[PDB]
Amino acid sequence: TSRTHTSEVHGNAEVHASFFDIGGSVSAGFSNSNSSTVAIDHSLSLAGE
Amino acid sequence: TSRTHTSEVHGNAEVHASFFDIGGSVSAGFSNSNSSTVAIDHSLSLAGE
């Protein structure tokens, strides 16, 4: 059984460069993520000797 | 055969600038998931002592 909790710190940038539209910025923030996982697995083996 | 659920509200913060008028944009997103993984495996080993 597995459960994942991750927060990713998201950062971008906003730069426009054209003939009549320019402007600069920088962004910052953090996200959230909560997971949950069950796992079922079996086996077999036959070993002669 | 495992099944992964991940429930997130990923919130990003973005501020955008222009030539005269500057605004911003934040947004978070709720969601669901059934990202399941199935597997099939075969093996073979020979030892000698």
Numbering used by the authors:
A (entry chain C), B (entry chain D): 295 to 343
Quote the authors verbatim.
Following assembly, the anthrax protective antigen (PA) forms an oligomeric translocon that unfolds and translocates either its lethal factor (LF) or edema factor (EF) into the host cell. The toxin functions as a binary A2B toxin, with enzymatic A factors, lethal factor (LF, 91 kDa) and edema factor (EF, 89 kDa), and a cell binding B factor, protective antigen (PA, 83 kDa). Within the endosomal compartment, the acidic environment induces a conformational change in the PA, resulting in the formation of a β-barrel channel that can insert itself into the endosomal membrane. The first α helix and β strand of LF and EF unfold and dock into a deep amphipathic cleft, called the α clamp, which resides at the interface of two PA monomers.
The available space on the heptameric PA channel for EF binding can only accommodate up to three EF molecules due to steric hindrance. Therefore, we used a symmetry expansion method in Relion for 3D classification and were able to resolve the asymmetrically attached EF. Unlike LF, all the domains of EF are well resolved in our channel complex structures. β1 (Leu33 to Lys35) of EFN forms parallel β-sheet with β13 (Leu203 to Pro205) of PAN. LF α1 is angled downward towards the pore in the α-clamp site, while the amino-terminal end of EF α1 is elevated ~2.9 Å as measured using the carbonyl groups on LF Glu34 and EF Glu24. This elevation in EF α1 appears to be caused by a change in the orientation of PAN Phe464. This change in the orientation of Phe464 appears to restrict EF α1 in its elevated conformation in the α-clamp site. While in the PA7-bound EF structures, the HD domain contributes to a new conformation by bridging the PABD and ACD.
